[model samples]
Target: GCGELVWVGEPLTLRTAETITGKYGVWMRDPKPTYPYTQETTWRIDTVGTDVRQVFEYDLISQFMQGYPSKVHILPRPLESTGAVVYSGSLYFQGAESRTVIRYELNTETVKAEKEIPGAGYHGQFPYSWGGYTDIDLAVDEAGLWVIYSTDDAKGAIVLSKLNPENLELEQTWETNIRKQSVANAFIICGTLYTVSSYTSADATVNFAYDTGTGISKTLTIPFKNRYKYSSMIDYNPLEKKLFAWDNLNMVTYDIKLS
Candidate 1:
């Protein structure tokens, strides 16, 4: 219900209204069992073309549903060298009150493989807690070794771990001094990793850049109002050499030029 299908380029619109008719389904009783019930409202869009057609639909569902029921917090991560692979992270309920993080590789059409963060626990009674990976940035170098940055509660800290793509083996771990609360997303470019800092009121979120080659670090203050729970950055167009980032609802763009 949370999927979109676009016919390349077109125009469409949708609307919804609430009524007490049972024509749809689902009933709602508010303020007491005798109160006038209001029907659930939904909007849908249908399109047709000579050789192509598309439809968009959605409904009210529990936000706690596991396995990314909707694209509410979908953020873009770095793609694999193949240029066709994109990564996404979400929470899954492995058992009652046990959650785990699941990172998936979607090759344009189908999901290639799902890599679970082993030993990762959940938030409530579902594995969704472990799947609370707000950010998932992956890069595979010339040696065929893939580097990943993810959040986990291990060693008594919410830290980042790098893993081997093929075998899914832990390679290295980095601990942050700040507590992991709403640290939303991460970005990596040219071996430099960047993440938003935790806990501040004014200019509360700071961008941290870590160089893997020199072990040097730099901080860039994010210019925005309010705070963000999840954020992400990526290099989408290689030819344009641009770096784009999304801090919650704010989208920022930067230019990167190679010498």
Candidate 2:
């Protein structure tokens, strides 16, 4: 609505994870947070084990650093990796080692829907350079939920698909020239896709962008930082206008300028 992504500021470290397994995980808040979690509360999943089910909850980011969580919720089934988001009161995640996307209602604590992205690669088949089996990265932007993945037919190129948040159905898809494994991480903002170059390097660039609205891909050189280095998860929260990232053992945020 505003303009193209102009800048991504330096990393603001929020919390240096409490557990060792927190080295590689995903932490984020729901874009449209609901009651009881009305504020921008934080939710974390330490995706280290095969049976990764525990979700650490924080009432506030300030309380997150205190090393104690407000609550800890368990998932019915194990999730795959760091590609997860708490969107619209539901926990959206990929099923363990599969292309299946699961929607678990937070309020009811029940599996609402489970749908697979047909022909999508999973379990390290087409992960980013960092490779956490982050093949099927689910994202949310102003438009809605999206799935950024690579298929056998697409041959490792990033295929962006808009998802029906209600049923996990693919509403539309656009294939981009950017290779999924070439970048360290990718996120969507204003319905445009952006990819980062390196996760381990402190100086990284928002190297590429693909606009689904216009069906055009372009090269970009906007600077991005990987403060802690070895970032495992990076996602943009449209409502907050911030990029929440899990870098090594630290959970951080980067304020961005749209204009």
Candidate 3:
């Protein structure tokens, strides 16, 4: 059964990105980790360049903090924004400046599938307040893989789509009333979507939550701090029960409690 978010502890600084170019990036690990990679394995992509394909891998957060990486995997095609997620032995990301979603096999270092999300906005059309052209954010939770974006037809509202991890096929979609540009960042947990109030607000809260199962949305007041005051990404790692995030140049995690 799915659990409801009840508490979010303060952000714990894991380590700051060594390179200045890593000011805004996506840092994550698979929720349902596969063979060879465990929950301790951390993956990062500095979404700062035109050709953003390099993925830095650390066997553990200790190694990541120590400025040591096990390997760097280059993607065949560059990804856009800070929305990529390392899930189930694959890196799911939005194609560079396009609405297309690409499933790249991590072990093989090749693309397994690519599919466009019809009518979805791309580039900077409907990005989160802080920008970075983060129009298509891929995510994962206990249920499965998901994508959070907006579309012209949806009028800039947040659109949630569930995808089949195998072929990148869209299985189902849900449209939320919350406007995409209003939130700082979002992460799903137990089939419910929670949004951050502000990227720069040090006293921000988990302002909103939308449940796909119930097709209902509610305002919440759970405290969610923005330690560095500029978090670019926030993804829930189910296996570890932590929210991995990149704030300014530092990578951090928030210990969460579910009811």
Candidate 4:
């Protein structure tokens, strides 16, 4: 509901292998999924030291997405404060129709969702995109948290805001004027939010840094030597001052080496 929308003037149907390779800029060679691919979350039970935990891994994403059947996009890490942790993601509609932003507040002690809120900055759906570039970015700022939502109609406008970590309420909002979507993943360092352009690229993915406080943004080339170059499921351990990434086969930690 923001900028000029261009209609192709022709009937736009969903992707076929033809369109998938052409329009999607992807080469699908093998077994095609019934829906091409429906992002599913697996239920996992794990134990660390003495704590044994069993929970529906998809519960968090399912609530916002309505179910695991839809290609649900989820924010892996929740921003935490003294009392609560805040989480957010774009709840994708069925058949990739659109996206609705959702935010939740989790009680730190109980690990339960105490409250959930729709993003105030969200007016409606962002442009439907298949590539990972449009994934949402959620991160922390010392004690509080911030979010960046994809803008539609234009290239990709980034709408970012600060939230009351305890209540998941909007504290501030602004236009970052970024005309492209994010790729792979993003995390906050200091006050800057960094994201890759696309994971399918090479060892060097086009990275971007947007200062959550200053509104100043720049581009960087962060070299990667791990499979994580595809999916940046990486996290920052503020206490240890290190970065950790898990790429299915290998889980490793890298030093805080960004320049």
Best by TM-score: 2
RMSD per model, one decimal? 16.6, 1.3, 1.4, 15.6
Taking the tens digit of each residue's C-alpha lDDT, what string does model 3 give over 12-82?
99888778788889888877768788777888888877889889888886787786789999888878989
Q: What's model 3's lDDT at 149?
A: 93
10 residues in a row with least lDDT, candidate 2? 196-205
- Return the TM-score for each candidate structure: 0.39, 0.96, 0.96, 0.49
As for model 3, its CA RMSD to the true structure in angstroms is 1.4
Candidate 4: segments with Cα more than 4 A from true spot: 1-134, 153-155, 180-182, 199-202
For model 1 the local lDDT of residue 118 reads 55
Q: Can you write out model 2's per-residue Cα lDDT over 1-259, one digit (the tens) per residue?
A: 5467889999998888767888889998988888778545889888877789998888887787676788888998789988899888888999897899999988788899999998999999999987889999999998889999999999899998999998999999999998999998899999899998873467688999999889989999998888877888999998888899988888899999998
Model 4 root-mean-square deviation: 15.6
Give the CA lDDT, 0 to 100, for residue 167 in model 2: 94
Cα error, candidate 1, residue 152 (Å): 7.2
Report the CA-based lDDT of candidate 3 relative to the real structure.
0.87
lDDT of 1 by residue, 60-148 (tens): 32221112122222213222111011222111111212222223322222223345545443331111111232223333221222333
Cα lDDT, model 3, residue 172 = 96
- Candidate 1 lDDT at 44 equals 17
Better of 1 and 2 by TM-score: 2
The TM-score, computed over Cα atoms with residue i paired to residue i, of candidate 1 is 0.39
Model 3: what TM-score? 0.96
lDDT of 4 by residue, 78-193 (tens): 32111111222221111111232223211122322223223322222331122322234444434346655554433356666675544446687666655433345455566666
Query: Looking at candidate 4, what is the lDDT of residue 62?
Result: 36
